Amino acid sequence: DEAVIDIFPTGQTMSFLRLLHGFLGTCRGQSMHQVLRDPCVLRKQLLYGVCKTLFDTITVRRVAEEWKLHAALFPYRALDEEDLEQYLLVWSASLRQSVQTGVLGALRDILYQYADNDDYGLYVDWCVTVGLVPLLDVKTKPSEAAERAQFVRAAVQRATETHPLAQDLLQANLALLLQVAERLGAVRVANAPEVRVFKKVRSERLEAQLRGKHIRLYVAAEPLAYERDKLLFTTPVAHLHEEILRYDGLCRHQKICQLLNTFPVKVVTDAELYHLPVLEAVRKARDAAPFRPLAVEDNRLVANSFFSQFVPGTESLERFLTQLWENEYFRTFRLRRLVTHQGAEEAIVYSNYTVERVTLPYLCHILALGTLDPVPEAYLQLSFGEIVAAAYDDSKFCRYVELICSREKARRRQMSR
Amino acid sequence: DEAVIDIFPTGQTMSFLRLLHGFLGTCRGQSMHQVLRDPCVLRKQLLYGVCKTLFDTITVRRVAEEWKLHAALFPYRALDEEDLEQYLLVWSASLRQSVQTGVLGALRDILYQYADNDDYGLYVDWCVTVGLVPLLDVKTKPSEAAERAQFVRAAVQRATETHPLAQDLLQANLALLLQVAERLGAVRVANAPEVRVFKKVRSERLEAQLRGKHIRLYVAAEPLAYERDKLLFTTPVAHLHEEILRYDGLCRHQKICQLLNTFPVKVVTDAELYHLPVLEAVRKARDAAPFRPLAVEDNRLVANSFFSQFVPGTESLERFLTQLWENEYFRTFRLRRLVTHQGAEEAIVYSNYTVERVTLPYLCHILALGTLDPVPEAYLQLSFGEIVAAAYDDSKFCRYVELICSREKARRRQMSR
Amino acid sequence: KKVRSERLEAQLRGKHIRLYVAAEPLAYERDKLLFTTPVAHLHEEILRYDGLCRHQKICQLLNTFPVKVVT
């Protein structure tokens, strides 16, 4: 038996998941936590990384090789003035859109079948309120690897039917595809009851265990510890814990005092109410909250009374706490507010510092990070499908279609002149 | 036994890390401390330093040497009008992009594997609240140096695969890479309980010891000391300690006076409420906060009463303290406020004076400072990957690509004319 | 939610059926488990608003008469 200071199952910390999901208190600033826990930015950045590693491979050779088949496939190019200048652009658009829908359908299938893990939507909570995440590594029989390796072939058959030329990149990088698929379904966020995490005091090598079994864990922001043996956190949400405690105390206090003096006079010594007419309501309300006096006996020392009627003003410190929440979440991750002219809070989105602080640590512990790349920020706002049309636009893929365009127009301009 | 005046484990200073992380005091100002303890600016500045030291080395010779391989690799350049003017730019962009992704992936791997130390966050706390930092120098066996020297090769193999020419810079500067990697994991921020720092009175050579063992420490702003044996600090946070302590006293005072006059009348002589309807709630409210009189016996001297109902106005001095926090942190570190037109507090970021005050002292005591260079302020806002593209754009790397493309176009313009 | 094997299921009238999950809620020593859905973030506030609505109605319906006397 060893003495070890614990962090998880106490009121200060188990209350954190209650408040951050608003079990006991909330305000107008809680929605920015909701826009922080978007699970779709995970699949967006993930597909951006895998397609950036996909498209950049065979840009230099395969375009001139697959020019040959579509040369005979489109019988054209009689005159150099009007046919050549217009045919190359629509052929280039055709090839890029066909490989685009191919990779889009294959990636949408292999995501939507087994990337609905919704674990990031707890991972950002553990990153934001304790500065570390408990997480389990579920292991299975290697027959499930054969299940996924079978499934990816019928997945890429939808791209095979769409495009013959798109399948050549996928048959090259199927190892990377099955790698990110297996590492995708390998690790969870450990939402299981009676978990316990702690800090070992004699060697500062704090560890996570689940149900008596020691597990792996990640640390992003370790909290500071001193002679106060309950240690203090550097995490963002603990910077505003006591303020929402004050707001919740004021909320309950306001409620319990406004339900205290409902009756009009004091001396000392169910939507049914709307439906029925007022002549039964005056009978039922007068009998409903009964008049009750209040008295304690005291002989030859009589009462001298005073009286107070007030409710606490919730709106002032409500606005104060919402402004504090908004300022806090804006400073700790630099959330942008793109609006129109004279527009107020149209849309709030992840920005450049934000994805580096939260998303790339997720892919760091996922250990798929060795190939991928963080997404541009306006690229994050764009569609699930339109994103790849800009992703290879960033790549040298259509930039080499520019080079084969210049080569074909030069080879035919010398043919004319 | 010697008498030595201590600074660390007293109420004025143990209170400091509690108030700065908001265990007691809080307002809209604490978020600017959160934007000051952002640890990613450390990794951005250090990667900027190592890539600026990287890219300027072999600018003058290797570009003309590696022109030779991509001359035969791209069969082109038949006509001088359209082929030369367009091919050279995309070749230059391809080369800079490929070496960029190579150094980016290698640096991201060697960062994300062992630069999640998050020590900078506490380092800026000790710089801001006591003007000096305690820190330990952990030393291990040299087998860990061999582990890192093994790990960097498999790290730069990811750059070796994508680009052959990028490995030649890394094999030249691998000593610098292992140096900054070893000095990266060399020192910590001393987050261990029961440490003690003090000032020796007879010899003014103030020192830090950890658990009976004397250690090294850094001093940035030593506090002034006089015949008052408790000494006064010149640090920024002690300039406004008493005001947030006043705010905390007023907050607790407001809470305790608001929770005192809850009952409507006075004489002299947990969401349980919301769910349940009002008719049992009015039963539970009167029994919940019971009426209590107050009485002291006094014969032939009777009571003559008075009454006060007031709450303290928290919002006025709250706004005062937030403006205090805002202009205080603005003047001590010249933080910029870039916004849009009619824009209020979009983003706050380090400027040129701020990094010189807080970051380069960190790299000074790191002792990797002899080869690096501070980052421009607008460069700090940019992406984790986009930063290197402007980093060698500042360098003469692509500036010599301008010289070699002018040389190629001159050598072929003389070939034509 | 089946407690020993975390493989929560849907049954209809004694017959087990299929179901979909999009956002699974977090579960702990509190055997009533807490939800991460958008609407549960604002359950208590609209419940407070309804308590205030009913309370306003019942206090307005209480002091309708212009004069009140005691005895």
Residue numbers in the entry:
A (entry chain K), B (entry chain L): 52 to 320, 488 to 635
C (entry chain J): 250 to 320
The study reports:
Here we present high-resolution structures of the A- and B-capsids and in-situ portals of human cytomegalovirus. The portal proteins are believed to orchestrate nucleation of the procapsid through the formation of a portal–scaffold complex, which facilitates procapsid assembly. During the maturation process, the disassociated scaffold proteins are expelled as the viral DNA is pumped into the capsid through the portal located at a unique vertex of the icosahedral capsid. All three capsids possess a mature icosahedral shell and are distinguishable by the inner capsid material: (1) C-capsids are filled with viral DNA; (2) A-capsids appear empty and are assumed to be products of aborted viral genome packaging; and (3) B-capsids have a featureless inner core consisting of scaffold proteins, likely generated by an unsuccessful initiation of DNA packaging.
Thus, the portals in B- and A-capsids represent to some extent the pre-DNA-packaging and the post-DNA-released states, respectively. Using high-resolution C12 portal reconstruction of the A-/B-capsids, we built the atomic model for the main body part of the portal protein pUL104, and showed that it consists of the wing (residues 52–90, 168–193 and 239–286), crown (residues 91–167, 194–238 and 570–647), stem (residues 287–314 and 528–551), clip (residues 315–322 and 485–527) and β-hairpin (residues 552–569) domains. The main body of the DNA-devoid portal has a hollow central channel with three constricted regions harboring interior diameters of 30, 33, and 73 Å, respectively. Furthermore, the portal main body of the A-/B-capsid locates ~20 Å inward; in contrast, each of the 12 monomers from the portal main body of the DNA-filled capsid rotates inward. As a result, whereas the crown domain shows the greatest movement (up to 7.9 Å) toward the central channel, we noted a gradual decrease in the movements of the β-hairpin domain (with the tip sliding by 5.3 Å), wing domain (an RMSD of 2.10 Å) and stem/clip domains (RMSDs of 1.28 Å/1.88 Å). The portals from the A- and B-capsid resemble each other and are arranged in a symmetry-mismatch fashion different from that of the virion: a C5 10-helix anchor, a C5 portal turret, and a C12 portal main body. A portal structural comparison of the DNA-free and DNA-filled capsids shows that the scaffold fragment binding cavity of the portal is closed off in the virion capsid, suggesting that dissociation of the scaffold fragments from the portal is necessary for the required portal conformational changes during DNA translocation. Given that the portal in the A-capsid, which somewhat represents the post-release state, is identical to that in the B-capsid both conformationally and positionally, we believe that inner capsid pressure generated by the packaged DNA causes the conformational changes of the portal.
